[PDB]
From a paper:
Monoubiquitination of [name] at lysine 119 (H2Aub1) is catalyzed by the [name] subunit of the E3 ubiquitin ligase Polycomb Repressive Complex 1 ([name]). In vPRC1, also called [name]–[name], the [name] C-terminal RAWUL domain is bound by the [name]-interacting domain of [name] or its paralogue YAF2, whereas in canonical [name], the RAWUL domain is associated with CBX proteins. We uncover that human [name]–[name] binds unmodified nucleosomes via [name] but H2Aub1-modified nucleosomes via [name]. Here, single-particle cryo-electron microscopy (cryo-EM) uncovers that [name]–[name] uses two different interfaces for contacting unmodified and H2Aub1-modified nucleosomes.
We reconstituted and purified a [name]–[name] complex containing full-length human [name], [name] and [name]. For cryo-EM analysis, vPRC1 was mixed with 5′ biotinylated [name] mononucleosomes that were either unmodified (Nuc) or fully monoubiquitylated on [name] (NucH2Aub1) and each sample was bound separately to grids coated with streptavidin. The vPRC1:Nuc sample showed a homogeneous population of two-dimensional (2D) classes. Three-dimensional (3D) reconstruction to a resolution of ~2.9 Å revealed nucleosomes with one [name]:[name] ring finger heterodimer (RING1B15–115:BMI13–107) bound to each face of the nucleosome disc. We could not detect density for the [name] or [name] C termini, or for [name]. The structure of these vPRC1:Nuc particles is comparable to that of the minimal [name]:[name] ring finger-dimer bound to the nucleosome core particle, determined previously by crystallography. Moreover, [name] F39, showing clear side chain density, interacts with [name] residues R70 and D71. These structural studies show that vPRC1 binds unmodified nucleosomes via [name]:[name]. Of note, H2Aub1 does not appear to impact on [name]:[name] binding to nucleosomes, as the [name]:[name] dimer bound H2Aub1-modified and unmodified nucleosomes with similar affinity. Our results argue that the high binding affinity created by the combined interactions of the [name] zinc finger with ubiquitin and of the RYBP47–58 loop with the nucleosome acidic patch directs vPRC1 to dock on H2Aub1-modified nucleosomes. This binding geometry allows the freely exposed [name]:[name] heterodimer in the same vPRC1 molecule to engage with the acidic patch of an unmodified nucleosome in the vicinity and thereby enable monoubiquitination of [name] on this nucleosome.
Numbering used by the authors:
A (entry chain D): 28 to 121
B (entry chain H): 29 to 121
C (entry chain L): 15 to 115
D (entry chain N): 16 to 115
E (entry chain E), F (entry chain A): 37 to 134
G (entry chain K): 3 to 107
H (entry chain M): 3 to 102
I (entry chain F): 20 to 101
Write the structure that this text describes.
Amino acid sequence: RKRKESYAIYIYKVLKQVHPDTGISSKAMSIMNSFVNDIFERIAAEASRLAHYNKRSTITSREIQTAVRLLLPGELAKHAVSEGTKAVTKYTSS
Amino acid sequence: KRKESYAIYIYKVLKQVHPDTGISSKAMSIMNSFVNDIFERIAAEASRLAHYNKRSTITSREIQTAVRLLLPGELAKHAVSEGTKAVTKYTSS
Amino acid sequence: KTWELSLYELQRTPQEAITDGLEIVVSPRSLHSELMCPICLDMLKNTMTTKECLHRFCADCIITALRSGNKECPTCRKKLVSKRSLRPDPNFDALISKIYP
Amino acid sequence: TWELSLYELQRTPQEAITDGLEIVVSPRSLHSELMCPICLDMLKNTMTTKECLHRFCADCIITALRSGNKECPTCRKKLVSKRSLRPDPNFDALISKIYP
Amino acid sequence: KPHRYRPGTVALREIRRYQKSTELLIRKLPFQRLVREIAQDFKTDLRFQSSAVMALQEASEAYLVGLFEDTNLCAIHAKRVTIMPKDIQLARRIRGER
Amino acid sequence: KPHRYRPGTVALREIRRYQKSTELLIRKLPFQRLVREIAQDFKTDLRFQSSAVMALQEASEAYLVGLFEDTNLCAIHAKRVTIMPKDIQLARRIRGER
Amino acid sequence: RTTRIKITELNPHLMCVLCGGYFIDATTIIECLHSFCKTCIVRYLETSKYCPICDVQVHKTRPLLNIRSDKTLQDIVYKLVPGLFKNEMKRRRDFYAAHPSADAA
Amino acid sequence: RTTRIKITELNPHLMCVLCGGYFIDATTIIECLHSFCKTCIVRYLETSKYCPICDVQVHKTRPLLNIRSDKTLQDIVYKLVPGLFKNEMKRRRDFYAAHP
Amino acid sequence: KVLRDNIQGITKPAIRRLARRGGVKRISGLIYEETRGVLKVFLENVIRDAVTYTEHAKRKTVTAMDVVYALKRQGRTLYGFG
Amino acid sequence: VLRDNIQGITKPAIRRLARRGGVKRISGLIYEETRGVLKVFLENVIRDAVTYTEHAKRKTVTAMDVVYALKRQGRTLYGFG
Amino acid sequence: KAKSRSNRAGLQFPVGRIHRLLRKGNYAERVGAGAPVYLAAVMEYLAAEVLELAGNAARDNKKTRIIPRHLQLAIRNDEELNKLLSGVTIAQGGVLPNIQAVLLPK
Amino acid sequence: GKAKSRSNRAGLQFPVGRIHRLLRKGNYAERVGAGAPVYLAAVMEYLAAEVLELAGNAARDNKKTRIIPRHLQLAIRNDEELNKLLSGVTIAQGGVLPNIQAVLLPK
DNA sequence: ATACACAGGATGTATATATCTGACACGTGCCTGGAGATTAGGGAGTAATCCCCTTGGCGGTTAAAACGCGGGGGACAGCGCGTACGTGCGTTTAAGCGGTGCTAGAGCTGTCTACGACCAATTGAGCGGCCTCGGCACCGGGATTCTCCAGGT
DNA sequence: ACCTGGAGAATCCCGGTGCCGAGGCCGCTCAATTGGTCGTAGACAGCTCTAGCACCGCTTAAACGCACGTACGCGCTGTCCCCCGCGTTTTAACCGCCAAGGGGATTACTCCCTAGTCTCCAGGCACGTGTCAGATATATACATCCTGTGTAT
Ligand SMILES: [Zn+2]
Ligand SMILES: [Zn+2]
Ligand SMILES: [Zn+2]
Ligand SMILES: [Zn+2]
Ligand SMILES: [Zn+2]
Ligand SMILES: [Zn+2]
Ligand SMILES: [Zn+2]
Ligand SMILES: [Zn+2]
């Protein structure tokens, strides 16, 4: 009965935003959850390494940006950087 | 400008094993890097082991399990024996 | 360096915009060739432009072409990985909406 | 396999000679199973293979492995490193006491 | 006289058929028995979850399909159409597994 | 007549020589210029520590030596003694780099 | 099919902001698909490394590698603007009529 | 050379600590190189999994795979001890005679 | 009980089907034993690491997450089991 | 000014590297393919090195940058720090 | 009267949960304010891309749902996404149809 | 009142306290137990001694007094277990083993 | 006289309707974790200074690269034999589904106390220079191993 | 079809000499050690109930064994052009300075941002329910493979 958490509802919301009239099965959502966890873990580890190399004790958005530059290939990195900067500028404006 | 490395300890071990033999600066650099790499690998595996079982403390048990996962064959057995011997000698002191 | 300005280009003057109210006559056949999607054979909608050859297409046309078929440009056969190699071109959309609403 | 036979299940123990008795021996008697196959001399700091139970001198086997094929000299079986052997103290002590 | 297909026709048929599907190609109970027999050499009286056996079978079949993919290229490299043990040995040497 | 060695002799001599030595086999300044030229597409007016150029060269040489060993294995598979571009392509594909 | 339109509505989508005149040998920056003149952009990219409008970086070190010619737009503007190609050719001939050097360019 | 060696000095090196007697069909444990009799080790290992001397694990689940017959040691004990091999064969044949 | 001979449960037609999914047309007759050897090696490695993970946790049952951690340790990430 | 410096990887250097690799007979179309392979490898490593240098707010590339760049690729180096 | 940070950033993936996961994960001593927002945006972007391609693949089959086969097709037919997941195995995904030219009949 | 080191209390040459501090400051877990650094230092010294002994034998074979990178490379690539431990590692100024394929020899 | 396009037979693959059920998708009540306000201190941004090391010029000596030629051995195509694969048939084995009963062990709680974090004072282990001989690098010489082609049979 | 002798070119061995890098010493200051208190992570006993192992028939689809013939694996031969070995002529890497200065590394000061604490309520998760998307079944209809047979060049 213990609570277990996942990213299922957020994935469903994104899918309804991109393909309004489509579903998804249990196994496909399991795979999507694994994909999201893998990405989070990789980026966090690379940011930690960056912070440690430079003798700093904080992870800021700068570390995340450089880690994304290091990890994703090609145009995926460009689009991800643009989206991240957009989100941060929107958030700090409140 | 105080810098730290494992040079003097590696030299002591070499003198223990090979009483009449020298080492070069680049070879000592390689040995330093090798020791650092092993330290990092075992510490990272121990960290993961503690996180999988929901514990906040790395102990000798985690180090032993990591050494078993990481080292191949007879190296694992010999390293396990040496670590256990060291801990037993330390505690009774 | 394939970009050195020619002698005339080093002294070319701007072309003054036409301000007098003169009517312009345009026929559908004049713009027929340059404003036609090679794939669907219809008027362009939701224009997408490649990052290598600057060839206009419809979003669905290029998406379907890349999905089931070679990962190449339909026109010049140049390679392109996926839809991220194209970008929208709203200027052509506005021009289409203006000339032929 | 290692399954015992009918007779092996009831072998009687062999009593030891408690009474003090002297036995005459000669060096040529044991000049076959106490001799190194490589250096053809007396064993010192004996080392034995795990798989085949073959005795060698430490230096002999160490050099043979380092400067040659990684097989056992006698049976020609797989051998990786000096970790694949083990010292034999009992054999050395017996040799020392038997031969001064 | 029946309608005998020439050699190789049914082979291409089956290649197409099995590259169109996603089902497991090895029977369950034999694989489970093999797994238990191998595990008996490391710890006594083990128990398994069903999903653990499923995960092992999935990973193993993926591994073997990829290996045969490389083996076929090695066999075509030498002007052949038939795979042999030497092709598997070369693929595993170059991949680093040996 | 003047002495001439049969083909394949000096090649074996050179294999014996270069498999026992340990020194760098690419000239230093040309590699340095190549490094600066390639880096000029990421940042302008960059400076390099000498040990950085040295590390880059050492790594590049190790990479090429490993590749050529795999290529020789692939070429011998097809009953030849001459290495060809297709052997390089096959080795790189099986390695996962292509 | 059949339609006639004024030049006022068409003007905005035909003039280069840098110079103000109609597009001549239009060239497009691909980072944002922004069209300007060949000479305008060639002169502009020397001093700056950002787009004139959106200030988007053309390239990390060398912007000239990320700009390409736009033939279709040039043909469209030639067909639309009345008496534009003829004037361009006349100006080019007039400029090069008094220079007896480098006949082949 | 010639020597007069007393067996009383060599008793501990040639005595099995499981049956209180001399080695018969010697078998050694790979990990620790501790010798015993075939019957002694076979019947003892069916319950425990540790050597009865140094207290070291032999195998995780099946110790029987890590014990090997030492022909050289058995030959040495047969040769050094007078009037033992013959007695062993006599007893074995006499036991075979008494049963079908 | 001591299970034995189970490797021969991987039959000839199953290996043929696996080679079909990999794009193979003709198969030599000495190639059914090599596959069994390779499968045995791979399985031994993965199962040993899974058993180590299980033993550290002080459990008597191997779980799917143990298999997943073991596979990830060998550079064979697997999506679909948690 | 730096241009066409990949031709400084002469043919005899390529032959020496192949000889250390054990190769006995070489085709005439191996050198261009080798140069392509090398250039791709160098682009990939130097990109990461320059990323590390840029993040640390410097203008000099050190040896640690190269070491970390190689470690990212799975090609650990020993003996430079 | 309380507004979630996800809405403030214009996002769906949770910003507070990701902030907490960064704080308790042994990455560094301190976590800034902009790090979780940035990372959440990147995760949302990648998920949306993959799901879009899989939806197209599902539409081609005349199916209204996405199954692991559709995800496999989407990922392997995409070059950059195929580089990102070069060492991953997706269960019940099968393979891509492919036959070499020398095996086909002439 | 005399200060007695932990390495001496353990019988090691490697530094126990420095390794303890490195473990504490490296972002590996919230807490570190007392015996963990002793175990890690013992393993590290064992591996160092193994490599050094092999390389010392290789240096003696060559009639040299000082260990150089070549001896490290020969000691490490002639041992199966150590080769498996360092498969993705390059050693500067090492070289390769001598190896010519059988099919390529004359006659 | 032989290639060769053609046509009829017969498999296998694709397609449209019927239908059956079980898993996706939604709703709901509750409780745990995210949000808001407050406080305090140390990490990091900023400005200034010093001096190590990176970049540039130049002149020289000499090993390495480039060009060319000639001939042998290695890649490549073709032909023939034969035997090991594939295809199809008629028996035999064991996977698989459904149902059952049993209980070992994974997942929780609740005490409770030993072990690790924190702080302060004290001093000895470890690091930055500095002096200096002995291992090793270099040069010339004699010995030693090994290809290669002419007889020799 | 195999052998030997002898000339030539290359690798190994041996002193002998000179320098420079590795081993060692010395003063000092920063980090490890001892001693004390305090709070909670982890050990352990006990309890619930889920799920993993074991057993039994019954169909039936897959596995197993057999036979024929065909096409592919492998050796042999002949051909020629591509690459190796070696000699001559050019290019330019390597090494010894000198001169300058950009920026890497450190120091000091200040204030802004992040951790820790406490209150309180909405976002997210565990159950429960019910239609319809998708699988399963039958039946034509279509598209490939193979072979006989005329017959044209
Ligand atoms: Zn279209
Ligand atoms: Zn195009
Ligand atoms: Zn010996
Ligand atoms: Zn042996
Ligand atoms: Zn303009
Ligand atoms: Zn712009
Ligand atoms: Zn006994
Ligand atoms: Zn023992």
